[PDB]
Design a protein around this ligand. Structure first.
Ligand code: GTP
Ligand code: MG
Length: 348
């Protein structure tokens, strides 16, 4: 130092000889060999210019990986005709989820539950129902058909709903344990309706299963996760929090509560949110496993406390910066709802 030789400075910077010589050439600093001596002006300039380029590349790298978003579990709705085994399938799926013991894990109903597999986690919507807009909830819809019954128009219509809901269809032929079961009949029904099973070279997905047995139900999961990978579901935990109201109700010893599914961003306790005209602050959050949750990320379905009113199902839960923002946004929707219902006076 004062003055330093190039081979010494290179050892300081953990740098290769030719690397530093290349760099010096760029800078316009003349030398002879790496044995040559550097002026302190040049040396300090090198020390600094090395810092820039290094930090910059780490900056370029860090901002490159964040460009790639974390994945999210698939959200799955189960549908079908009455008696076709919908509920039993749902109920079974719960039972397979804790294969261990009580509890622990109060297993409270947050409007959805998660089935964790060695492949990955699947989010199943658990709530009514028959289904009788709103915001997109399920990525995947599972259309259940009894093998001993087959395709009713009810099933046909539950199919067209999921297509209007933008959900990828998965057909499950159920009750295959019955002697009067006819899975082939159902395939022909699906085909004549324009859904061609993969085995026949079409894009339709058909998994035979028994909600009674548990037979092939494992296959159904692997396929969901499979199609999930095909669709590559992902969400940004850092975006402005966005979610959807599954169900909202009243526990008299509690008061207004809401079951919410998180889609984008991360909700936290203390956040102000507005769902439709409903709003409030988040006092607490509780998951399917019962834990009191500080934060909720995409795929998380949680119990929410602190809404002022009961929010409508399927409404979008959206983060807001403060209480005054919640009021104004929620109120503005009320005015239009009110006044446009007086547009519903005449003549409609
Ligand atoms: N043999 C057989 N019976 C089943 C199977 N799955 C469901 N069931 C029977 O189907 C009957 C009613 O179907 P659920 O499982 O309750 O489905 P669900 O509640 O009727 O569905 P929705 O009426 O549309 O609400 C029950 O008696 C079940 O025992 C199955 O995989 N095999
Ligand atoms: Mg039922």
């Amino acid at each position: 130092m004062a003055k330093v030789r190039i081979y010494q400075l290179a050892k300081e910077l953990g740098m290769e000889t030719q690397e530093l010589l290349e760099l010096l050439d760029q800078m316009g600093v003349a030398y002879k060999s790496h044995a040559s001596t550097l002026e302190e002006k040049d040396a300090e300039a090198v020390r600094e210019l090395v810092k820039e380029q290094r930090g910059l590349q780490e900056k370029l790298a860090e901002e490159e990986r964040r460009k790639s978003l974390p994945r999210r579990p698939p959200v799955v709705v189960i549908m079908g005709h009455v008696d076709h085994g919908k509920t039993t399938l749902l109920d079974y799926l719960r039972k397979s989820r804790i294969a261990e013991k009580e509890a622990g894990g109060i297993t409270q109903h947050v409007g959805a539950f998660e089935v964790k597999t060695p492949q990955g986690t699947v989010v199943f919507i658990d709530t009514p129902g028959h289904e009788a807009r709103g915001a997109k909830v399920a990525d995947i819809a599972v259309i259940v058909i009894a093998a001993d019954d087959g395709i009713m128009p009810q099933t046909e219509e539950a199919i067209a709903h999921a297509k209007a809901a933008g959900a990828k269809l998965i057909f499950a032929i159920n009750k295959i344990d019955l002697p009067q079961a006819d899975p082939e009949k159902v395939k022909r029904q699906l085909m004549e309706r324009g859904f061609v099973p993969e085995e026949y070279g079409g894009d339709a997905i058909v998994i035979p299963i028994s909600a009674k047995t548990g037979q092939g139900v494992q296959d159904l999961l692997e396929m969901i996760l499979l199609l999930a990978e095909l669709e590559d579901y992902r969400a940004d935990p850092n975006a402005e929090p966005r979610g959807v109201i599954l169900e909202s109700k009243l526990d008299k010893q509690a008061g207004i509560i809401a079951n919410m599914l998180v889609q984008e961003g991360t909700f936290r306790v203390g956040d102000y949110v507005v769902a439709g005209e409903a709003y409030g602050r988040i006092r607490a959050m509780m998951d399917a496993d019962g834990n009191q949750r500080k934060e909720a990320g995409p795929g998380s379905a949680v119990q929410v406390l602190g809404f002022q009113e009961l929010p409508h199902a399927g409404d979008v839960v959206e983060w807001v910066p403060d209480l005054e923002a919640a009021k104004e946004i929620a109120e503005e929707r009320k005015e239009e709802r009110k006044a446009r219902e007086e547009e519903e006076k005449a003549r409609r």
